Each structure stands twice: as structure tokens, then as C-alpha cells.
């Protein structure tokens, strides 16, 4: 209610400790903070964790109470709700280990709970479909910035972090700072009267650009007709984590037809982005999906392999690499992809029968799921509506990056594993190249033999943050 003044009080902070790694890391915690005045769901609270030194007037890793970075990780995956995280959390989903390491590194951590597509309100109505996830993330950032003077950490050094749909959430927060689109939603929640632009983005395998992801996926995987992925199993886990088992299928003839069409469409979409190489050349694909853009994808995979080769990894786990002396000199990209295998069927994101996580993300209180592409609406196998075009644009980080803007975070670190088939490699590459081309700081790689996952390179992520902030 209006009684909630959204004022942080450091007297709320209580002392705790956690092991990392062989050592007791001391910090203070304030949990279950209602970060808006009119929440519609119990999940909309945030936790604050502060290195102990900052309540005792001292320093950690070059930082102090006034100056520490504020890491804002989220636990969103699959566009599902993401509970507020905690270094003590053992319940799934959690990146508690990352928070423990972040505190040791001197970062203030503000971990906000985020609605997602299955969230319902007290009356059982859905209230977490798009754009709830990003509205909540923004409302948490606003809480932090509004409380700059009271909350330890520098609110001008907010760095979001997330994996998968949570990586899209982090990227979207960095891309969409202070966008008017979201203001009515934020006003209706009674979010704090502050800005929501942030300093830097960390994103692992961001599942974004949804309305073009089907095109990209078939550009990458057309010609591969079997798909292999995972499905939940029964049993009850001590920590609530889901357990999985493999499952596969073969594309139907309908799917093969759509696949070849979606692949062709990708070239038209890609070329019109006007992506440019470092020499100024337009990165393009021809009608067959071949060209300088494909050469960039290949070179990033060769670079991934070279880094691994140099460490004594056997890169011939996968097919296609040409090694000459000590150098990975080329790559048969089709062979590599056949050995990696296709994960998703067709379309991979906007399913014709509205059964994907992304379909459900684009539902609303009336419609459980919607299409978000013209192709899937036209070819729908169930009665269905298309989501509003403005909403689809508003939740795509690329919509904001057609220019050099100062609402956009200046610094980006994006990773997508070279063994990650949850979206085409083209999707994070497009994001990275657009950022580069518009003058933003972008540190990008496809780490070797990494699956769909995040937070596996914290030493390097933290060195990047410290390079920006110390």
C-alpha cells in the first residue's frame, strides 16, 4: 500500500557468514523487502546482501560502502518466475554460489524476485506474462537508485546478471533504460520514483529476439532432421530441483517445409540489419544462407576451438575442425552442427500449436498463449491471436540498439556456449555485433564445449567488472 515508503534502512541488515572457499565470508542481509507499493504477487520482494566491511567503515577489493558495484542477478529461466536469490538458498532455482563469490569480491548484491509466465495473483488470474519480467526488474533497479543514499553500494554501478531467459532479462534491462513504454506499468505497481538505466550487463545465453529466433534456428539447423532435448521426470528432490531425462523426435514433412522457408527468411532479415565487420564491410547471407555473416559465425567457433586446443583440450570431440600444426585453420560448419545436434523442433520458439514457453510468455490474463510471428499465426494449428507488435518490440533488446543511446548501458559481457543449442549462435552474435557497431563496450565469446548454462567463468566475469569499476 501507500504505507510502504520504499525507504531502505540499513538498520535492517543482520550479520551472516558463508564459506568461500576455505574461508568465512562475512556479510549482512536484509530479506523480503517489498520493492513496490502495490505488488500483485508474493514473489515481488528483493533481498540485499552487503560485504561486512561496508557496515564497519572498511574496504574490500578496492571498494567501499559508497563505491562498490551492485550486482543484480536474477533466477529467471524459461520465462518462468525467478525467486529472489540468496547466498544461503539451496532450493532450486538458485545461483547462491555466485552471490557468495560476489560478496567475497566486494560487491553489494541486490537479488530481486521476478514474476514469470505461471505467476498468478490472489484471485488466480495470471499476472506474470510479458512484460511482467522486465517491469519487475526495472522496479527493483528503481528501488535501488531511489535508495542510493541509504543502500550500501554505488547505484550508478548496477550490473545485471542472468542466464537464458534471465540473460534476456539482464540484456533488456541494459538496453531499455528509462523507456516510456514501461512507465504506465511501473506507475501502476507504485514503483519508486527513480531512473532504471544501469551501468553494465552480464548475460549468459540470452534467449532474446524471439520474433526472429525461429528463422535463425532453421538457418543453423536445416538439413538436420532429428532433434534431441530433455523432459522432466517424477520423484521428489530435497531441494525442489527438477530432474530430467533425454527425449528425441524426427521432423515431420510439414516441419521440413517450414524449416527450409524459415532458413530462407533468415537471410532477408539478417541482411536488412546492416551489420558491419571491423573493416566496414556489410555482413550478409545469400539466398542459400552462405556469406560473410556465416564466415563470422565460423570464425568465432574456430576461435573457441583454438582457445581450448591451446589448453590441451581434444577439440575433435566435435566434427569439422581442420588443424594445421598448432593452429585451428578452418571449420566445416555443417559437420560441426551435425555433431552438436539439433535440440528443438520447428518452429523452435513460436510453436504452431502454442505449446512453447515463449508462446505462454506472450499470453495474457485472457489468452494462455499467443503467436508472435506472422508465419506461425498464418500456419497456426490451433485457434490463436498474435501478440501486440509493440509489446514484442518492447521486450527485444535489439529494438533499442539501432543507435548509440545514453539510456543504454555502456558496457556488455555476453557469453553463449559453443555446445549450447537452445538458440542459434546467430542470435547472441547479432546482439554483440550490433553493440559493437553502435559504439558500446562489448566483450563476447562462445566458450568451448559449454552447454546452456551460466556463471561458469566467475573469475573472468569478476575481472571484467573490476576492470570497469575499480
Q: How would you describe this structure in keywords?
A:
470 residues, alpha/beta, Rossmann fold, globular, Tannase_B, AB_hydrolase_fold, BD-FAE-like_dom
Number of strands: 13
Please bin the fraction of helical residues: 25-40%
What Rg is obtained from the alpha carbons, in whole angstroms?
22 Å
Instruction: Indicate the proportion of strand residues.
Output: 15-25%
Q: At the fourth CATH level, what is the homologous superfamily?
A: Alpha/Beta hydrolase fold, catalytic domain
Characterise this structure.
This protein has a 9-stranded mixed beta sheet with strand order 1-2-3-5-4-6-7-12-13, with helices on both faces. It has one domain: Alpha/Beta hydrolase fold, catalytic domain (Rossmann fold, 3-Layer(aba) Sandwich), CATH 3.40.50.1820. The protein has 13 helices and 13 strands. Helix 5 (210-221) crosses helix 6. By secondary structure, the chain is of the alpha/beta class. Strand 4, helix 1 (96-104) and strand 5 (108-112) form a beta-alpha-beta unit. 30% of the residues lie in helices and 16% in strands. This is Tannase. InterPro entries: AB_hydrolase_fold, BD-FAE-like_dom, Tannase_B. It comes from Lactiplantibacillus plantarum (Lactobacillus plantarum).
Amino acid at each position: 500500500s501507500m504505507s510502504n515508503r520504499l525507504i531502505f534502512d540499513a538498520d535492517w541488515l543482520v550479520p551472516e557468514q558463508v564459506q568461500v572457499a576455505g574461508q568465512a565470508i562475512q556479510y549482512y542481509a536484509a530479506r523480503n523487502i517489498q520493492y513496490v507499493q502495490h505488488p500483485v504477487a508474493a514473489i515481488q520482494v528483493l533481498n540485499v546482501f552487503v560485504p561486512a566491511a561496508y557496515l564497519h567503515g572498511s574496504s574490500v577489493n578496492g571498494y567501499q560502502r559508497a563505491t562498490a558495484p551492485i550486482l543484480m542477478p536474477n533466477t529467471v529461466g524459461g520465462y518462468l518466475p525467478g525467486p529472489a536469490d540468496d547466498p544461503q538458498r539451496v532450493t532450486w532455482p538458485t545461483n547462491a554460489g555466485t552471490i557468495q563469490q560476489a560478496l567475497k569480491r566486494g560487491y553489494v548484491v541486490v537479488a530481486a524476485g521476478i514474476r514469470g509466465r505461471t505467476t498468478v495473483d490472489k484471485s488466480g488470474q495470471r499476472v506474470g506474462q510479458a512484460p511482467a519480467f522486465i517491469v519487475d526488474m526495472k522496479a527493483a533497479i528503481r528501488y535501488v537508485k531511489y535508495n542510493q543514499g541509504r543502500l550500501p553500494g554505488d547505484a550508478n554501478r548496477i550490473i545485471t546478471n542472468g542466464t537464458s531467459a534471465g540473460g534476456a532479462t539482464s540484456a533488456l534491462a541494459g538496453a531499455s533504460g528509462n523507456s516510456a513504454y514501461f512507465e504506465p506499468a511501473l506507475t501502476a505497481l507504485g514503483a519508486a520514483p527513480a531512473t532504471d538505466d544501469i551501468f553494465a550487463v552480464s548475460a549468459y545465453c540470452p534467449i532474446h529476439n524471439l520474433e526472429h529466433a525461429d528463422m535463425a534456428y532453421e538457418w543453423q539447423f536445416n538439413g538436420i532432421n532429428d532433434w534431441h532435448r530433455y523432459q522432466p521426470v517424477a520423484g521428489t528432490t530435497k531441494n525442489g530441483r527438477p530432474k530430467f531425462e533425454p527425449v528425441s523426435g524426427q521432423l515431420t514433412v510439414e516441419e521440413q517445409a517450414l524449416s527450409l522457408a524459415l532458413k530462407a527468411q533468415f537471410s532477408t532479415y539478417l541482411n536488412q540489419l546492416k551489420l558491419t565487420a571491423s573493416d566496414g564491410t556489410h555482413l550478409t547471407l545469400n539466398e542459400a544462407g552462405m556469406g560473410s555473416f556465416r564466415d563470422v559465425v565460423r570464425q568465432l567457433l574456430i576461435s573457441s576451438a583454438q582457445t581450448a586446443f591451446d589448453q590441451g583440450t581434444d577439440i575433435h570431440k566435435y566434427a569439422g575442425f581442420v588443424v594445421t600444426g598448432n593452429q585451428v585453420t578452418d571449420l566445416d560448419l555443417s559437420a560441426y552442427l551435425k555433431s552438436l545436434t539439433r535440440m528443438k523442433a520447428v518452429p523452435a520458439f513460436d510453436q504452431l500449436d502454442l505449446t512453447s514457453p515463449e508462446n505462454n510468455l506472450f499470453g495474457d490474463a485472457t489468452a494462455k498463449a499467443k503467436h508472435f510471428t506472422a508465419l506461425a499465426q498464418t500456419r497456426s494449428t490451433v485457434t490463436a491471436q498474435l501478440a501486440d507488435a509493440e509489446l514484442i518490440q518492447a521486450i527485444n533488446p535489439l529494438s533499442y540498439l539501432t543507435t548509440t543511446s545514453s539510456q543504454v548501458a555502456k558496457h556488455w559481457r555476453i557469453r553463449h556456449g559453443a555446445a549450447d543449442r537452445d538458440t542459434s549462435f546467430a542470435i547472441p552474435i547479432i546482439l554483440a555485433i550490433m553493440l559493437e557497431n553502435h559504439g558500446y563496450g562489448i566483450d563476447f565469446a562462445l566458450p568451448w564445449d559449454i552447454p546452456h548454462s551460466g556463471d561458469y567463468d566467475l573469475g573472468d566475469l569478476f575481472s571484467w567488472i573490476d576492470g570497469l569499476c575499480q
